[PDB]
């Protein structure tokens, strides 16, 4: 059962490590495919830290306090495979995050949050999965 507070200190490290792996496709991905789709996490998904951090110092009167494999990823033979593999299931803790603090959160702020998160990274796990049969099915 996640708070306003619990879900923006879990979801920033998550959020970054989307990013991280996100950064690593600009230069690693194989298909141009998977570097738009990047291209797309770190925009959407910087953003979103930008909000919640904001919103946590407002509503806490304090700063944000400070699980995927990086190593694993950089040195796979198919970089796109490897992507997908992580994302997929990490994204879809992301939509469960949010589905949940949707029914407990009373704050607008966080509503439309959770809608954005659970949209745009549902469609992009849709995207993955027909991507990997596509190239490796
Ligand atoms: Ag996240
Ligand atoms: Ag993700
Ligand atoms: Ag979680």
Same mark, same amino acid.
């Given at each position: ?29 194989? /298909? ?5 789709? +990047?291209? !797309?996490?770190?925009?959407?998904? #910087? $953003? ?42 990490? /994204? ?5 995050? +949010?589905? !949940?603090?949707?029914?407990?959160? #009373? $704050? ?30």
């Amino acid at each position: 059962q996640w708070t306003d507070q619990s879900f923006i200190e879990m979801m920033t490290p998550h959020h970054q490590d989307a990013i991280d792996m996100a950064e690593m496709a600009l230069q690693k991905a194989e /298909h141009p495919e998977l570097k738009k789709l +990047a291209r !797309n996490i770190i925009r959407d998904q #910087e $953003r979103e830290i930008k909000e919640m951090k904001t919103w946590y110092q407002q509503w806490f009167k304090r700063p944000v306090p400070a699980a995927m494999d990086l190593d694993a990823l950089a040195t796979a033979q198919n970089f796109d495979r490897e992507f997908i593999r992580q994302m997929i299931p990490h /994204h879809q803790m992301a939509v469960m995050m +949010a589905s !949940n603090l949707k029914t407990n959160t #009373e $704050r607008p702020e966080m509503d439309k949050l959770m809608d954005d998160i659970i949209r745009s990274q549902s469609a992009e796990i849709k995207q993955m999965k027909q991507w990997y049969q596509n190239w490796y099915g």
